[PDB]
């Protein structure tokens, strides 16, 4: 049914496309990117939120980083959508080192 | 003693990322609860074919630990990402369900290999617990080979034990001396 | 509405050649309630993931680590096999299980 | 693990005189004890302002341990000579009283030592218990420090537990197997 | 020197680790079981992480184009074998890997990461390794990107076949033929 | 790691004399080209009987990595005047022909054993690929033995998106927050 990385957090947000930072290039199949392109015109509840890391910076600054739901992301970005579906998840700049390495910024 | 943590010296600290139990991952040490007394209690493996009953019991039963002022803490050497996947893979699949306590991540292995309970050759924590005081003392060592739990009750009567001797230790001088007025005949 | 263990065939192991060498903390509630489910619905009821571990000389061995509460229900309900996904797996596997309890498989 | 003792090897071994329950003096081993489980416990010192009640309820409920096939055994660092002396002390002028459990003499510090319970500034044990199974191989460490008794409740919980996980290792090849035959559709 | 004791031209580290292979059950396999067969053996860092596992996905997809150049790909990370399963039978919808065509690794000792020499210490983690072994079991190639830069299967295979050509054209008898001045 | 180049540490910096591609000698260090991606490529011997077309193949795209903001350097244990003299040496006669990239020559063979492509036994360089970043860190290794010579193209992919993650790192906070205004409701 539901996210083994957002089960357990109720609510979904409207995340606007223009704030989720994906730094992450995707190797896109765009039979799968147009196959949920249908799957969101014809049934929206079909496709999951996607997950993203919400990290506070040094001086209190939100950053929304998407890793994830590539296909799903691309799709909405086809549909020039406004927002995407997305449960948000707190975590650390430690947690963001694992996925970046010495790209990680000095997030403020 | 058990491997460097030492009954009546301070428990070694940690600092290591835990799944909370609202579901985030938070930085957290051992010295941050301080004022607190600590339940901390090592399992081997995440997603294991056992029915995991006693972490279970741990979290089902986290109001009794916290009425008596202290605060359980689970610990493995899986990733967070791990142990953020097993809360939420639900039973019915042999995951864990959520959790009230935290579920502290040790993939360096030095914290199992700090409380003397790191089986080598795996690469895993024994079954070990701790008890821990309000001061960041040791003052029990609890260590089982992988296949016997651990009793929520056992603990809870060790922390009410604990508890019971540190408050007969908040004293004030005796009022009262010994002489030739008290001597009974 | 599967299982992260065994994620294709099912098969009817007979309770008898599973050994289940950890004991069982069982809610008798819970039991009660899945002997029910069995009954009414058995396609509820996940099958149980069971290990299959060969010896040193290719004995064959059936370890029941999970599905606690519901081998106890198909236990009560006297049936000769529950419905099981077998994964095939070492006798190291099987050490973090048992310990100093593991025996000396043949 | 425990000063020398690990989860999982075989125990450490002490010859030591002990103070056997019928008020003889014996040299005996851990090693003479193969074939049972050894539940062996560290007390501090004899002869101490305590009402003796710990030691005492694994003396009296010693007939529990017998029909699990299992042995307990007291220790602490005190000669044989004290160890007599406490015993034939009885109870209402703070003795120990006779004894179901022989008492382990370890005048060198070098058992407490190897087990990993010795409180090195004072040169006495902490309450250490250890579980030992029939193989002789150590399952269990419980270390408590000085003001928290042992129970036996708990003790006789992990003794059983062991035991249950030891006879279902005692199994036969299935002479059953999987195939066409046996699928669920 | 080298790759932490990995050393090109040496024979590979030998590690005996408990995999999960594509059929979902557990063996214990050692790189010397491969002997014979070209090894693609490559690191991630950890399983259950956010990202797409698209990498680890495209060499499970093309596993048939490694097995008709007689090669076998192995992947590894430091997560348990019960992990690497839990990991497989998660579907990707829900942020898992799904079902694998190659055998995953297990390394929680972090030795068979140390000894390739990438092993991020401050982590516990391997960073995005990849090594190419002979049939021999001899290392002829090391790749080790920082953790955001994923590997291609295309140039994968552009030098197992490179490194097979060479292999092949030394399998000579001597020269049949004289010059004469 | 590799000798003593360890991935996300600073790269092991050298000072050495290069065969610049205009033909001069200059006395260049890695650090010279902070603020620029840098590829460091050793290969094993000039003069040798193979066509050098791993080596021109850079050299010809060396346009495409500049475009990258990102300089292209060769280097093996040969000195100085040797490089100049393959260059000078036409392709048609076995030589390299002319170079849009600095080869950087090491005669002490230290800065082969600093990234750990040195093979003791020939006094050579392995066929040794590294990626630094415009702050000097390693990102990237790759090491071939002598057979197998490296993509133009797979050096482009890796420079690219270690250009692509390191970009989407400038990053200003989002100016949005979740709320009442932006939850999802049960439909």
């Keep these: 049914p539901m996210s083994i990385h957002s089960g357990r957090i109720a609510a979904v947000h409207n995340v606007p496309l223009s704030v989720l930072i994906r730094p992450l290039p995707s190797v896109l199949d765009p039979a799968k990117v147009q196959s949920l392109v249908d799957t969101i015109r014809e049934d929206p509840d079909s496709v999951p939120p996607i997950d993203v890391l919400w990290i506070k910076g040094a001086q209190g600054g939100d950053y929304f980083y998407s890793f994830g739901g590539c296909h799903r992301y691309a799709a909405y970005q086809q549909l020039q959508r406004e927002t995407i579906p997305a449960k948000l998840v707190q975590s650390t700049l430690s947690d963001l080192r694992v996925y970046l390495g010495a790209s990680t910024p000095d997030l403020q | ?185």
């Design chain 2, 1 to 185: 003693s058990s491997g460097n943590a030492k009954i009546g010296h301070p428990a070694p600290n940690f600092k290591a990322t835990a799944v909370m139990p609202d579901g985030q991952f938070k930085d957290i040490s051992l010295s941050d609860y301080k004022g607190k007394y600590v339940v901390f209690f090592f399992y081997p493996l995440d997603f294991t074919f056992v029915c995991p009953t006693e972490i279970i019991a741990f979290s089902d039963r986290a109001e009794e630990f916290k009425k008596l002022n202290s605060q359980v803490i689970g610990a493995s050497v899986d990733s967070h990402f791990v142990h953020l996947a097993w809360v939420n893979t639900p039973k019915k699949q042999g995951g864990l369900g959520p959790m009230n306590i935290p579920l502290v991540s040790d993939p360096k292995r030095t914290i199992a290999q700090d409380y003397g309970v790191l089986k080598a050759d795996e690469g895993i924590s024994f079954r070990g617990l701790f008890i821990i005081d309000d001061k960041g003392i040791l003052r029990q060592i609890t260590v089982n080979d992988l296949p016997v739990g651990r009793s929520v009750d056992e603990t809870l009567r060790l922390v009410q034990a604990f508890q019971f001797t540190d408050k007969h230790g908040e004293v004030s001088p005796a009022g009262w001396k010994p002489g030739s007025d008290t001597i009974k005949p």
